[PDB]
């Protein structure tokens with residue numbers, strides 16, 4: 688069920704949830720996938736992560752207009768790297784309210800990214816403070832601790848068995864933890880397990896750069912990360 692639209696792919700995961708996929712040519716790697724989510728909540732649409740670029744992100748909004756034809760209320764981004772935040776200006780151009788971890792907004796300018804308009808803060812138990820994430824509805828946002836990056840956040844969709852760990856979680860067949868340049872190797876394993884414990888009923892774990900996987904993706908990530916302590 689891959690639906691093509693311009694240079695992006697959309698896959699329905701649940702009645703009100705789609706995966707968006709965009710591609711960037713990376714030296715030595717070919718055309719690399721980056722995934723995010725689109726959630727319909729009543730008369731509005733919510734987006735998790737931008738595409739790699741503004742032009743790709745504008746495509747996501749065009750697909751939404753064509754397939755759903757409801758306004759995009761807000762977008763949240765999972766960390767300050769090009770794959771998840773590279774299209775922030777396309778959301779601003781569209782008048783969409785944007786949210787990121789406060790640390791993601793602090794890091795974004797130096798990473799050559801546009802900061803979100805709103806900063807998220809987190810309770811002691813990792814769950815987003817609702818006063819910083821107003822109107823999020825079925826989007827449940829969780830800071831699991833540092834891993835792929837210090838700012839990485841994760842999201843579950845209430846009324847579904849879907850959770851998304853962004854770049855924190857690797858696929859169950861991965862041979863690498865990937866980008867360790869900005870990673871917290873001492874805390875990585877605990878952060879991966881904290882994500883699994885936050886969404887214990889999630890059976891469909893959306894991957895950052897590959898097709899959806901099982902909870903084995905969380906287990907495999909944490910076991911690889913245990914090796915770096």
Ligand SMILES: Cn1c(=O)cc(CP(=O)(O)O)c2ccc(N3CCCC3)cc21
Pocket residue numbers: 713716719768769770854865866896
């Ligand atoms: C090279 N590179 C980069 O320079 C940057 C990314 C983005 P992030 O650090 O994963 O946020 C990247 C993402 C995926 C990726 N591939 C996945 C399968 C093979 C390589 C490469 C990436």
Ligand SMILES: Cn1c(=O)cc(CP(=O)(O)O)c2ccc(N3CCCC3)cc21
Pocket residue numbers: 835854855857863864865866867895896
């Ligand atoms: C190899 N690899 C991979 O196999 C996978 C990733 C993506 P993730 O970090 O696991 O989400 C990846 C990301 C960045 C990267 N490098 C950036 C500079 C050189 C390579 C490599 C990655």
Ligand SMILES: [Zn+2]
Pocket residue numbers: 766768770835836854866
């Ligand atoms: Zn990243």
Ligand SMILES: [Zn+2]
Pocket residue numbers: 770854865895896
């Ligand atoms: Zn990644």
